[PDB]
Amino acid sequence: CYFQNCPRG
Amino acid sequence: SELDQLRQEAEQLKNQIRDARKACADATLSQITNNIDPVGRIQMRTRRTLRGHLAKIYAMHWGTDSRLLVSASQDGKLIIWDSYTTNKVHAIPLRSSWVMTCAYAPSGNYVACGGLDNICSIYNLKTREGNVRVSRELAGHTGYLSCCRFLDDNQIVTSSGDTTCALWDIETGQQTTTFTGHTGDVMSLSLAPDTRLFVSGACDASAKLWDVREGMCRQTFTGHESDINAICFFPNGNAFATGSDDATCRLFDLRADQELMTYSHDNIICGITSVSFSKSGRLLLAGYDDFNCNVWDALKADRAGVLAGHDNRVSCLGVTDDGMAVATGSWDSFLKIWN
Amino acid sequence: DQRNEEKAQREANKKIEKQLQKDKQVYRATHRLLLLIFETKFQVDKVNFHMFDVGGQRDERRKWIQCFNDVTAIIFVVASSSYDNQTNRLQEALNLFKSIWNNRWLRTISVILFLNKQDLLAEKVLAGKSKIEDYFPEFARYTTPEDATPEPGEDPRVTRAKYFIRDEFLRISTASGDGRHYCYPHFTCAVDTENIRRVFNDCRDIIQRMHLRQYELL
Amino acid sequence: QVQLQESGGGLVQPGGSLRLSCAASGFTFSNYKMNWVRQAPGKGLEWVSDISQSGASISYTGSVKGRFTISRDNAKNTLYLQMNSLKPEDTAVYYCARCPAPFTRDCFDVTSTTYAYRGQGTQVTVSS
Amino acid sequence: TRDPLLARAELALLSIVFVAVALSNGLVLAALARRGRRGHWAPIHVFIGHLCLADLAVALFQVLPQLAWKATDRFRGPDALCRAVKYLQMVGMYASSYMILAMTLDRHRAICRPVLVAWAFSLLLSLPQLFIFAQRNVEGGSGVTDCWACFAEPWGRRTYVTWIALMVFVAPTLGIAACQVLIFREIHASSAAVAKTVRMTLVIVVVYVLCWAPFFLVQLWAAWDPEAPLEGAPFVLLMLLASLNSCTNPWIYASFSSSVSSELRSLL
Amino acid sequence: NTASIAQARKLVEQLKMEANIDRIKVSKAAADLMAYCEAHAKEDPLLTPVPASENPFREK
């Protein structure tokens, strides 16, 4: 969830 | 040996004058300080801080007009802050660069700079535009101009790092009436609020009071083994309080010829640089080397209030000669004003 | 006036604030020190370090030298040559060193020093500037260091005298150590080139070593 | 007020069979350092000894290293020190100097022109 | 329980970053009460702590978006057009490492305005990834559209700015390596001060390396992830470091000179 | 810092010129002192803290 490195939810 | 026999005469007269001194030591304030009310608590918290500077303030002087503040720093600078416009106007560099003591004038036409440089500068003020000009610099007094005065906007008296005491004059720029009786290494002196009198500083503690005319017959104030840094008057033309470096303020009295009460009430192991009386003649604000300053009753000899805004020493402080603010100048570039 | 000159005050202090900022930044970048107000400024490697003497005042100085906060050096070294009439200046210098090494505010002052090398004939000239058993006994007993260089035309004592002074100086500095702190020896090798060169080297180490006294964990 | 009147000296041989002492006056002697300084013929401001905050380093100059001892005592209010057997027939007038600024363990100022807090002198030379 | 593990992890990280902020406040009170503000921070005091101001900025402007980007509440679509939002987040990562590089350069220039220099490096690097990752909306709530994870630029060229980021990573690593090796070499420029000064300098270097190692480890694992598992587990460690840096620098930086310890004992 | 021989001469001349100075009773001098102080004791806001009503530098 940084540099668009995130899972969902 | 004329030197030896004359010096022996000197101890003989010293013994006689000390006998007269002891005879004059008829009583002491005991009842007055015991039955009069303790002064009470003091807060005087952070009100006006001069965070502008960037060096170690070495001296300061409020102006009798209570308008603008001299601060003879160690940058080649000599700033002039303001009393009630919360800011500064004429931040004026210096020909030489390092000066210890400040000075000032009643009105605003002059302001001085006499300190480490060994030259008593006297600035000027034509207009508030940039690059504020310089008036007649004064020199000719060897050793750093330890502290010097402007009674009115025309007269200049100095006692400086030469173990002499001289009265120049701004225009003519020569000796007017010098004074030669002193032996220490002066580090501060102040002027009576009626301008008729200034009182010297000293290292051998003999904080002399001499009259501006010629230094008439007066007294040299023995005792008090540390240095004096902190002399200011209360509006009575008879007594002051030589602040101290061995923590021990005093209240020598010109009228009675005698010291009255030392302030060696412990919990303090530091020095004091400047003290100026709240003109009530009752409080006596002398600052202590730690980040705080502790009040001293002039008539009860009991500390009653704290003053903590610095971190390092406090190098010179002062009170407004109107009775509206007390200002403090440290070594840590911090110049504080308390209500 | 003030009912409208509020802008006058703000512009006055803002203008002089920019001027003051820049000028005292030129000051605050550069570095300075006492010496043998003569700003005989040198300049090397992106700084013109602000060298200056003080001589001229009287001798007793407890409050003048009190002024030197952030004035990072000692240099005074003497030899009691013809120019009695001359004797024991080191323990004057060394005493003064003890002073600057236990004063309340000179204590945080990374000191340095520069000796003299005209001591090629220490014991062979005048016997007063000479280090003999009548001046220092430590000198008579003392050994040689962990690195020597006895240069010719000198008695072995006249050679190792530089290191002996070094070790006495380190004595009063760190062997007494009253402050857990550091002092720097040197000497004159090439005038105005090696002198000032090592000045910059070990004075960048001075500011380094202040950086280590002041925020030690680099 | 600082009646730092000397005591001892005047005349003595290399035997040095004499003791020098001082006079203190009305202060926190239990917080001053001290030291004694003598006067070589004209330019004599050497640093003969000292005595730190009682119970600390007590150092001496190279000419007298290790040999002198310096006496401090609150009750007698008189700063003593012993002399003998090593150049005590000096023509150097001693001075019961006093390190200013008490409550910190340092001092300055062995200046060559009359000093503020130091005594007016202490004669010593060779008797007949 | 869509993200219970994520919720708990981010809450713990919230707590640690908040206490890092409190420590930063103690630090700024120290910088108020000692030695003066910035004229231009060449000497000692004024430089330290501006790093922790960077900490304040990154920590708070970090806790805001990272929590808030689950646009179930308080969001009808990103308020700042999904660009200025993550601005603060990644300028935070940058500026943090960059002013700690600044302290490297301080210790290097001294022993061998930089902060606006660092923020300058931050801004141009800030532009591209969010310029194209001001991304194409994907429907968050069946009729509500917010900026949602759309990419078309990064593979328009080779491997994207991540390698630039890790070169920026390695630069301070070698910076502290250099400073420690040179102070090591220095102690005998010409025996207890040496054994003293060795240990804590080694401490600084090792704590540096340990702290930003998780960037490297999460980077390598997330290189291992795109093919087989498509997981995001060690991201807990990644943001644990995102704090770790910004917080230990407060406390390690207290651990130098005891100035910060003495100030905390004075007031907080 | 004056060690000249004539420094003794000047000091003793000043001392002799101080052999006849004014003498004032300590008790009555101090009496006038605290009478003065108590007469003014209503002026300085530092002495008894009078609030910012009249004080200019009551800023934010």
PDB file of C-alpha atoms in Angstrom, chain E residues 6 19 29 41 44 69-70 75 77 128 130 142 153-154 175 185 198 204 212 216-217 237 252 259 262:
ATOM      1  CA  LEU E   6      -4.456  -5.385   8.178  1.00  0.00           C
ATOM      2  CA  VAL E  19       4.453   8.178  19.893  1.00  0.00           C
ATOM      3  CA  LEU E  29      11.033  21.750  22.535  1.00  0.00           C
ATOM      4  CA  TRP E  41      22.711  24.883   9.718  1.00  0.00           C
ATOM      5  CA  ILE E  44      25.855  21.423  15.550  1.00  0.00           C
ATOM      6  CA  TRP E  69      -8.120   5.251   1.286  1.00  0.00           C
ATOM      7  CA  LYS E  70     -10.664   2.551   2.118  1.00  0.00           C
ATOM      8  CA  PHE E  75     -15.112   9.981   0.727  1.00  0.00           C
ATOM      9  CA  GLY E  77     -14.114  10.208  -4.458  1.00  0.00           C
ATOM     10  CA  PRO E 128       5.323  10.864 -12.518  1.00  0.00           C
ATOM     11  CA  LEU E 130       0.931   9.832  -9.411  1.00  0.00           C
ATOM     12  CA  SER E 142     -21.679   0.532  -7.534  1.00  0.00           C
ATOM     13  CA  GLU E 153       2.775   4.264 -17.936  1.00  0.00           C
ATOM     14  CA  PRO E 154       5.275   2.213 -15.874  1.00  0.00           C
ATOM     15  CA  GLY E 175      27.116   7.213   3.015  1.00  0.00           C
ATOM     16  CA  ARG E 185      40.655   5.544  10.014  1.00  0.00           C
ATOM     17  CA  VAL E 198      34.413   2.744  17.936  1.00  0.00           C
ATOM     18  CA  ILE E 204      24.757   3.942  14.307  1.00  0.00           C
ATOM     19  CA  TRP E 212      16.022   0.094   6.241  1.00  0.00           C
ATOM     20  CA  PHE E 216      15.051  -4.487   0.623  1.00  0.00           C
ATOM     21  CA  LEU E 217      13.394  -7.627   1.982  1.00  0.00           C
ATOM     22  CA  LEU E 237       7.025  -5.163   8.074  1.00  0.00           C
ATOM     23  CA  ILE E 252      18.662   6.792  18.402  1.00  0.00           C
ATOM     24  CA  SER E 259      21.035  16.178  24.919  1.00  0.00           C
ATOM     25  CA  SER E 262      18.356  15.503  29.304  1.00  0.00           C
TER      26      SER E 262
END
